[PDB]
Amino acid sequence: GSGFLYGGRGMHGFCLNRKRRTAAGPRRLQGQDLVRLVFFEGLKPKKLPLRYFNMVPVFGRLLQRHRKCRYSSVLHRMCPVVELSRAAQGELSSLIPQHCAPHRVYLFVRECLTAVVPEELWGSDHNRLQFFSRVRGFLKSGSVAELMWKIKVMDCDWLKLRRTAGRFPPSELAYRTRILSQFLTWLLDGFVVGLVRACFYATESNAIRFYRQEVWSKLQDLAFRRHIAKGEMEELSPAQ
RNA sequence: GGAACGCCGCGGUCAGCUCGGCUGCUGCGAAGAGUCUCUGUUGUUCC
DSSP: OOOOOSBBGGGGGGGGGGGOOOOOOEEEEHHHHHHHHHOOOOOOOOOOOHHTTTHHHHHHHHHHHHHOHHHHHHHHSSSSSOOOTTTTTTGGTTSSSOOOHHHHHHHHHHHHHHHSSSSSHSHHHHHHHHHHHHHHHHHTTOTTTSSSSSOOOGGGGGGGGSOOOOOOOOOHHHHHHHHHHHHHHIIIIIHHHHHHHHBBEEOOOOOOEEEOOHHHHHHHHHHHHHHHHHHHHHHHHHOO
């Protein structure tokens, strides 16, 4: 659907870590793929219209930043672990979940947003902060496209087709807001919820609580890896 | 306020090519979304 409850099986599930259609092997997402995921639907075989085609570099940059973001490490920082006792260390420690205060799982999401989303996309710091505000509220509920704004459309140059700041008609402003709405919607509905659906088992009591079983979660990430690998092998290795 | 595409400003989430740029066709030019608030505007043209 588009909730973020009832799973923390790890970052291997995160949208930005899906691989594109294995035409002679499965490859990691390119800017053009992310663009198609945000503004069309990613499962568009045809070519991108020039306006969107010109934004393949920023989205490629987002992917880069995502790939260098160390989510595990930010998580550990913002959601510190309660130290169990020696004698609980090991198996029991991996059976017992670790709660993370809601404001803290928000702080995680906040810093990840800051890490991976290029600034050119925010347009203004004012736009970033307003969005964080929505995220803050989003993370407490269980909101609409129009409701998502004290957001300054003319701050985002990237919505332009050409970088000439000549006068534009109403129809443009509309088309610009639409594009921005689509991206901010994906940032909220795609990135944010993907994030918490990946790193936290979240549950509702009317407060959301966030749990985590890191080690078990990391084993899931690792097990995924060996699984898809065993898959490829079987497809390459001969009969008999 | 009604119109318009020659002038010039901004487009087409649309179509052809043998296609990341050409041309074909084609829209808009100061209000739009919410329900007073958020995002926005000098001056294209014609009466």
